[PDB]
Amino acid sequence: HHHMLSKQLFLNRCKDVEEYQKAGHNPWPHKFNVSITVPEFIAKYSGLEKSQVSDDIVSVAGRVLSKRSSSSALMFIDLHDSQTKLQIMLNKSAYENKEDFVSLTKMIYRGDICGFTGHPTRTKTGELSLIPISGMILSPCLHMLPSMHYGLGDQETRFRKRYLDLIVNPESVKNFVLRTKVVKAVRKYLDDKGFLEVETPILNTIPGGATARPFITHHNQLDIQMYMRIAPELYLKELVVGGINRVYEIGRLFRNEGIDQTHNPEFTTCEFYMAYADYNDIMKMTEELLGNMVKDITGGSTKLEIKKMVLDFTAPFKRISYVHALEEKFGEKIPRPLDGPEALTFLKKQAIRFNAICAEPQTTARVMDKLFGDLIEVDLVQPTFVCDQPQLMSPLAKYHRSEPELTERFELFILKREIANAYTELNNPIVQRSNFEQQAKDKALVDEVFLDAIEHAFPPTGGWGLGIDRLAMLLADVDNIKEVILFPTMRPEDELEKKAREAKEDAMVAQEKA
Amino acid sequence: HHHMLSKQLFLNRCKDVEEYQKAGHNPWPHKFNVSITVPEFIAKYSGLEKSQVSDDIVSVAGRVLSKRSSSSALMFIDLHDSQTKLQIMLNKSAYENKEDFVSLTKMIYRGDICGFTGHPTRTKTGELSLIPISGMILSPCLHMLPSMHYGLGDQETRFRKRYLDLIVNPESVKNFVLRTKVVKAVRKYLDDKGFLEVETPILNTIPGGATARPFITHHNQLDIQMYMRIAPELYLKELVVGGINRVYEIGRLFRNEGIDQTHNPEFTTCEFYMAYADYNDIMKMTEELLGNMVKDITGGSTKLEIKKMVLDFTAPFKRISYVHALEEKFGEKIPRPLDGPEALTFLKKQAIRFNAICAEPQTTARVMDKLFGDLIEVDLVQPTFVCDQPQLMSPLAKYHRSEPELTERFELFILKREIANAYTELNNPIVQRSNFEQQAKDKALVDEVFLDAIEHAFPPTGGWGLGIDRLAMLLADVDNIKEVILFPTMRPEDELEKKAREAKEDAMVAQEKA
Numbered sequence A, B: 001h002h003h004m005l006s007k008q009l010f011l012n013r014c015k016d017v018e019e020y021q022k023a024g025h026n027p028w029p030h031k032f033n034v035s036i037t038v039p040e041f042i043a044k045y046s047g048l049e050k051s052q053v054s055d056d057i058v059s060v061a062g063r064v065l066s067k068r069s070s071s072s073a074l075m076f077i078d079l080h081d082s083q084t085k086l087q088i089m090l091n092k093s094a095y096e097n098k099e100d101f102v103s104l105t106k107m108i109y110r111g112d113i114c115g116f117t118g119h120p121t122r123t124k125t126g127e128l129s130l131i132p133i134s135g136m137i138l139s140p141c142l143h144m145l146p147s148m149h150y151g152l153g154d155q156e157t158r159f160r161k162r163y164l165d166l167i168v169n170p171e172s173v174k175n176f177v178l179r180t181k182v183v184k185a186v187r188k189y190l191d192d193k194g195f196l197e198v199e200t201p202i203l204n205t206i207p208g209g210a211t212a213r214p215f216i217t218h219h220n221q222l223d224i225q226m227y228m229r230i231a232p233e234l235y236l237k238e239l240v241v242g243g244i245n246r247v248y249e250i251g252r253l254f255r256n257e258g259i260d261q262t263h264n265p266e267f268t269t270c271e272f273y274m275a276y277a278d279y280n281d282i283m284k285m286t287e288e289l290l291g292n293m294v295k296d297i298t299g300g301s302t303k304l305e306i307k308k309m310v311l312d313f314t315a316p317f318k319r320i321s322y323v324h325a326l327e328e329k330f331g332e333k334i335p336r337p338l339d340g341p342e343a344l345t346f347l348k349k350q351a352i353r354f355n356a357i358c359a360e361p362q363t364t365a366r367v368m369d370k371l372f373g374d375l376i377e378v379d380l381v382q383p384t385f386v387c388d389q390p391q392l393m394s395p396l397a398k399y400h401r402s403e404p405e406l407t408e409r410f411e412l413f414i415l416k417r418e419i420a421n422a423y424t425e426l427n428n429p430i431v432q433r434s435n436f437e438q439q440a441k442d443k444a445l446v447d448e449v450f451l452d453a454i455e456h457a458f459p460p461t462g463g464w465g466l467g468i469d470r471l472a473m474l475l476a477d478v479d480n481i482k483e484v485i486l487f488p489t490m491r492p493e494d495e496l497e498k499k500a501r502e503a504k505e506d507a508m509v510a511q512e513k514a
């Protein structure tokens, strides 16, 4: 008989509650006035010591994670609020309503949300506590909360029921608080620099020239097929055309592709565009911003990740040129026209020499990308900008102002992976048109609106993009993106894994009762 | 021959540009260092007076909206930046490169993005200007920018090409700057009160019990149909269950319905949930927040909208009870069991008396809603909370703690319309279950995850929601939501309105040249 005991416990718990409601007690009261939060409590009354009782009358509320008593007239409750704990010493002699004292002290179940009003104290055991004059059930818990900790690992039982995870693994909250701290740090930095935070469409009537598979939907009244955005770039750029010099958007993007530890179907990035700025300015800005972030997290620009290891966000960051690093380790330089014959015939040599086996098709772009990917990326642990990618690698970028066959852009690598990137955006409408068309033919309708917009003179502009989820990952020292996303996209379980899950869920309980 | 002259102008403009590029001049330079923005310029050098020339060398950049000369050695350019203008007095005798002076002063087209480096001055005409030592084209404009102003009204030519609108109607920028100012005002207020700004899924595997038609999409790898969110409520509430006491999200919602002046397929709202708080607290918070917003906009809590009229955001706001206002104007009170027979038979009386013709079906909820909608809503111009809606009207709300047949919630009405709303959220898992099931049968799969979550004791919580787009509308004194949305969803024009549009676009030019 499938999950026999937890059904039994749910039913008996509902019973307990409604009989507690006839008994005269409203299990879900409308308002309990909380005079102080338990972190504030700890901050205010830590100066107390053993057996010393404050004269104050404060009221707190949270979730019971421990109910244990050494006597019928003396109970000890671990109440949890904002991921910190305060003990509740329920002493009968100190409780006003002796009749209610009993009823409350029996009805309380582990998991119940409770409120208590009483005197701050520190017991003879050193444990900071509150001695209630009056308490009340604020919301009864109808299920057995898992032990503490539970779900380490087995990530799916955690992420499917995030509300349980945050309770039994409170440390995980530290992660999300970091993430918010990140986005704020971004916004502030940009806002203080005259940027206008805006909102551009998520639904588009044009799929975009990007190769990534988009989520596809349909608008009924207009009877048209629409697509979810892959990036806000075009609209933002149209805003810079429109006269808003500095714009930014921290938005939700959508890719209908695979799901792994670094990919979620819907993710969050930050893009900004800044008129009359080049990728150098954006580099300094990036150093500045990430710097301030890390120095909030710690105090110095140096962080420590996983035993230990240090990540030095001290300005300036390392920076290297692409083809200059490839030529730095190949032996000597590379043939001119990089997209040419001699350069590919040359590339293949180190693409059989340096333990590098490239793939098919063997495009110059591909052998160059793999040679840089296995070879140069490997020991890029410290924050470093890889700059001046070739036109071979950069279709929609602007040519480098000095040295030929290169472009003005960079990719910020930290800990083997790409965190952010920037460009001296291409503002040539003719070239942009050619590239857009050539792109559309390559993937075989183009965004003529945007082409028109930039045809109305798009100012020299610096573009920047940051992976919010991945930056959060890197700063929380986690290797799974679901660790920095509250409700990551889960494959809906059928009744197989469901049945197994519940079955184990009883295996625990039967392990207790026997 | 369709749009004959603007094609001609585009081609001749491209010509002009490339011949200007052989001539030795790069039409799209990579970096122009702007030493000062023209609002900063005006703020710094306004103290100058007629014929007085500063010794400083500053450089500015913007978009030419006027090129006019009284001599070949003296040109006057209205350069626009951040929606303000600075005149550029190009005097040959003050220009270093006399050879370049000429070339630049001829190549410049109205609409070009230009940069100038020179001395701040105020001319004998009182016009604050800058006399360049050197200038440069930063990005050429390949089309004829419409006159100023243009597109008033004819909202669609504006909103399809927003980048033009923001140029020829710079006042419209004031609107969007307001909107951002709004969201920041929200975030701050909440952030300073311990709230955690979070991000919940937009894509869901469950459609939701709401009646609104959702946008429908498909995830390929999981081979499952997914739906775009109607509200973040459930997830946020799961976060409050999880131990995060105060959460909020300013997010993008999606409704696959109609498009009008107050509706856009994708819109933006703010929701927050706050443990151990009731709708009264949320009322005071609402007064506080909106108050601060308005007082930033002006200086006092009193605003002025469209001739003129005043909106008094002074705390406290007016507040009335639903059935108490209906009974305030009906004549006397209403029969008990409001959902009952005598109450409907009673309702029909004033639903033939008070010029009120209700509709079919004649549900008690419907006749009550219409009677309140035509009658009580009408002269609610000042910010006022309509509170204590009946269970007839409130399916998923919590019963009122005192007076029967009412619930704990409010709707903030300003200027005939609903701006925000709040609840003392229902935290009874059994009742919530019953309501969810009954709802699902009413619209005929339910969200069992959320039901489980609240079954694990959901604390007494206050919920709040605000219409960001509509609040922005109301504070910008506009009657169209496209006025506060940058790129509102437009029905893609076929070649009919397209051809007509371009044809008129030439009618203008031919009106000039003849």
Ligand SMILES: Nc1ncnc2c1ncn2[C@@H]1O[C@H](COP(=O)(O)OP(=O)(O)OP(=O)(O)O)[C@@H](O)[C@H]1O
Pocket: A255, A262, A263, A264, A265, A266, A267, A268, A269, A418, A419, A420, A466, A467, A468, A469, A470, A481
């Ligand atoms: N599914 C996703 N989840 C989280 N972030 C993503 C996802 N897809 C793309 N990004 C972000 O978008 C940016 C550009 O990614 P790109 O277009 O290279 O996708 P990709 O080829 O999948 O990259 P990678 O293979 O390195 O994940 C990256 O900085 C990354 O942080």
Ligand SMILES: Nc1ncnc2c1ncn2[C@@H]1O[C@H](COP(=O)(O)OP(=O)(O)OP(=O)(O)O)[C@@H](O)[C@H]1O
Pocket: B255, B262, B263, B264, B265, B266, B267, B268, B269, B418, B419, B420, B466, B467, B468, B469, B470, B481
């Ligand atoms: N298409 C939309 N555009 C902008 N805001 C919307 C849209 N749909 C809903 N909202 C917002 O959602 C909130 C709840 O709206 P509701 O569920 O009553 O939709 P509705 O029945 O269309 O309302 P109304 O008819 O008053 O617009 C409102 O405060 C409104 O501001």
